[PDB]
């Protein structure tokens, strides 16, 4: 909103950045007034980004030194509520459209004191503002999905930062990657939140234009973190032409300044050096000097506001991977394969039963598993930025991942078994439908949660595919149906298979303990159906250790989670 | 090399461009001399882009209208012996180093009636004219594979070019995506090879910095497709000076010249074409009209000669694929795995050793064709650049491609069986075990041309990962393990299987024809030994189907890439 937008004079002084003891800074000195559009200018590794992140006050430590003062104090948490920083990637959902994307972030940043349509009201508000009203129902896509423009992605991503009302904004590269007048109206609108609207913007521009260039109040010009040059845009080729540096050929001003910033004019650096400590830097040390200044009911309800909201979201962008047309193909035809090689089924030949229930087995586990070890490694850049700027806590943003796989992933399994149930001639009735149809929903959620421990444990979403995949071949060959005779030393291996287990529970609600197709074969090829159908452990073990597996690979996927900060 | 570079006066008049009846050019008229270096400017567009390529021949038809002169004649086929065309994208293999990628393309290119010591003369004399002397030994990598430069991908890009002399130069925005002094440094070798080496060099800057444009000899700005102005570029202020337009704040030449050609001049575009077509125009159009000017086996060998030195780059380049360590991992697991759960193994458990035999079927089926379905898609924007340059001709290409993978492919599939045969207890013998072998790699090929086949059709490669995984998912299931009471209408299926034909291999092999496993089991669990390891098909029914299998669906990929032009 355009009112007096509280005001924040930042200074900073001698500030000195060291990573390992290459010198990033050494001993910039500048002070940034409300109502003012200072850019940073400079070479690339010359400590532009470096600045920026120190203003922004996100690179503290021992390898930061000097001050860095917000109304001749310090950096608390109180005044980075007040600090809005725009990064250079853009990290946004691609499906969801651009009301949608900014509707789910006022939600989320603004407190819950405020009414849910205020806060609508603040989302509306900053689409006008950046001008996102053409575009507001448009997708945001990425590079495989079509979207909106390349400037109003970044526009998407400055309206992030300008629903807190931020006093002071601190944007770093936003104008690289666009067009040569898109990138004029953004630092015409960037201009317009300093001069019109009482904010402190600082910005870093990677390679103004001629009339981009004509837009700045103060420049600040950096050579590898010395400083050239503070002051007044409009005031930056006098200065240098009373030091003794004049250009040859028509220029853009911004050209001429980066051609002395590293020392390559044409008839220096450290030339230019002592003349800025000379004749403008005690004079900028001056103005450092002369400018002078519920309950516990409510954190649980907090939460569940956050879970609500993200998962309302992941529901609108997370059902295009769930409901891809390849993957809906991949189980129809599946259908349509294993309805054909069974069709009409006698119970009677049991050993073609028994592939019938271990290829369910074999799918089902096979496929929520490789889909699920993609979903952690593909929001991690996502999660780290929108955990750190407030908006949930991991715990909220893991629960709605959790509850929102349990929606998406069980549609299709359901839809698998109520065609080929019928038409296979499996066990008739509605009590041994609802019974194969809960055992092998509960399977396909137990190997749902093994991808999603690997992908959380091994956050490269390639390296993880490789190690699901030879996880879920030793839990095949371990589940029961290829080798009879196993060796001594690998009887235990099947008792950690989730294939072991939904298997034996299927065969066990078909058959039965045995005994009623001993009424329809002899024996009671003997002691195929007493290793085969009666098996070894009970269902409720069945059950139960399917359900530690459950609850025991999401709580390894948490805490795979919470020891990266990622 | 820098001598007199026969010379080429070219010419165009009138060229008008439509495609579907939106006009890309409506009358350009300009000339380019020997030793000139043009460039061409103008916003997004404007047609820069398209009059580059009927500049370069390569865009021809009834779409094209006026008149391309080289040397005031028409484009044949022996003017563009000395045309050379740098696109915009750079298409190259990212694990050759930068001299094995320019010595290959300089066998390929260049004359065969040349020794090789010239053609390695010749590709050690472009990567010194380019200054790609510190880079040589580096590979070139890619966004993942960590290479050479942005500014050196570009210079890659021209060698390919320079190799075959070309007295006319033609580059789609080289300074693209390059760095301030990268894209000037690439500006001084483009103006060196006109001004030093004798060269027509004409290109397209997209935005020009305040010295790149000091270094363009003359200047073409457009528009839509107008052409406002043709000259020297220190003469292009002054034109428009003495038309009425002046520029106000100090700017970059061709700042002010991008401004005025889309008519937004601070204080008109409608005013500059008339003003072009009565001062500068009739000057132009007066200078086009002044300046007037083996036997058989001799092929066979050609061809020889062009596949081994294709065998030899893609041996170098697809084999951090198929000896990937994510790869070797998957099958050194796999046979832990199989060597662990059928341990020193009985015969005489029937049912246990076709389960082993079909899980190598079913390993070695679903793997190889998986691999082999994103061979083509990935290769489709360099085939089409290098087949359209010469270079190959499709049946080289694809030769090297089928020749290329019977070598890699089968060392994987050899160290499987090399570990589980003797572990796992199989038929003793060295025959036994090198018919094993035998069958398992005519099958590993005859299933790997499925996904070849797949893959050259459908040209995406997730489209076709998905086909390849149904067309594996009917060919297990008809496989002859899962289903031994087939109904009657899918018999038919298992026909077309190539699991089916690797499977009654492996089981003659290790069984015979029955009658010495009935000398262990009473019954000459009776009909046992009488659809399981007796079969329907012959031994040599099932070796010629495999045969058919790996010519065939090797036929198949050629023809399905031999309609796309790609």
């Not at 950046?130 to 998407?156: A, D, H, M, P, Q």
């Not at 309206?159 to 002071?168: D, F, G, T, V, W």
């Not at 030879?470 to 009879?484: D, P």
Request: aromatic share 10%.
């Amino acid at each position: 909103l355009s009112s007096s937008c509280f005001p924040i004079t930042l200074k900073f002084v001698d500030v000195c950045y060291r990573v390992k003891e290459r010198t990033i800074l050494s001993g910039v000195t500048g002070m940034i007034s409300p109502g003012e559009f200072m850019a940073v200018l400079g070479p690339s590794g010359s400590g532009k980004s470096t600045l920026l992140n120190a203003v922004a006050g996100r690179l503290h430590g021992s390898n930061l030194t000097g001050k860095i003062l917000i109304n001749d104090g310090k950096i608390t948490k109180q005044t980075l509520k007040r600090t809005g920083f725009v990064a250079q990637d853009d990290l946004l959902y691609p499906h969801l459209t651009v009301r949608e994307t900014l509707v789910f972030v006022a939600l989320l940043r603004l407190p819950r004191s405020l009414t849910r349509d205020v806060k609508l009201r603040a989302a509306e508000s900053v689409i006008s503002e950046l001008g996102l009203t053409k575009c507001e129902n448009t997708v945001v896509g990425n590079t495989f999905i079509r979207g909106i423009s390349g400037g109003e992605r970044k526009r998407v991503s400055i309206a992030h930062e300008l629903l807190i009302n931020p006093s002071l904004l601190v944007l770093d590269e936003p104008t690289s990657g666009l067009d040569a007048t898109a990138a004029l109206r953004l630092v015409q609108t960037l201009a317009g939140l300093a001069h019109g609207k009482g904010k402190t913007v600082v910005t870093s521009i990677h390679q103004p234009s001629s009339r981009v260039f004509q837009m700045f109040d103060t420049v600040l010009l950096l050579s590898e973190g010395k400083c050239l040059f503070v002051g007044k845009g409009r005031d930056a080729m006098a200065y240098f032409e009373s030091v003794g540096f004049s250009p040859a050929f028509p220029m853009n001003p911004a050209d001429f300044l980066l051609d002395l910033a590293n020392g390559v004019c044409q008839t220096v650096r450290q030339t230019l050096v002592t003349a800025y400590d000379t004749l403008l830097a005690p004079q900028v040390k001056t103005c450092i000097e002369v400018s002078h200044f519920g309950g516990i009911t409510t954190c649980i309800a907090t939460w569940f506001s956050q879970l609500c909201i993200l998962l309302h979201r992941l529901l609108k962008e997370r059902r295009h991977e769930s409901f891809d047309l390849l993957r809906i193909f991949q189980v129809v035809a599946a259908s349509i394969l294993c309805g054909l090689m069974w069709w009409h089924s006698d119970y009677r030949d049991v050993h073609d039963r028994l592939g019938l229930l271990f290829f369910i087995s074999i799918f089902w586990g096979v496929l929520p598993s490789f889909n699920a070890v993609f979903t952690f490694p593909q929001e991690r850049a996502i999660f780290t930025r929108e955990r750190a700027s407030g908006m949930y806590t991991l715990s909220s943003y893991f629960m709605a991942h959790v509850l929102g796989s349990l929606s998406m992933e069980l549609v299709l399994p359901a839809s698998f078994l109520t065609f080929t149930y019928w038409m296979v001639y499996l066990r008739p009735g509605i009590v041994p439908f609802l019974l194969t149809l809960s055992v092998l929903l509960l399977y396909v959620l137990a190997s749902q949660g093994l991808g999603l421990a690997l992908g959380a444990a091994i956050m490269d979403a390639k390296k993880a595919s490789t190690i699901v995949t030879v996880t879920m071949l030793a839990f095949v060959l371990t589940g029961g149906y290829y080798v009879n005779k196993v060796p001594s030393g690998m009887v235990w291996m099947k008792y950690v298979s989730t294939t072991f287990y939904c298997y034996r529970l299927l065969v066990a609600i078909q058959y039965g303990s045995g005994e009623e197709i001993l009424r329809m074969l002899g024996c009671d090829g003997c002691r195929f159906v007493e290793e085969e159908v009666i098996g070894d452990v009970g269902m409720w073990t069945s059950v139960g250790v399917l359900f530690l597996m459950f609850f025991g690979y999401r709580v390894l996927a948490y805490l795979a989670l919470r020891r990266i900060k990622h």
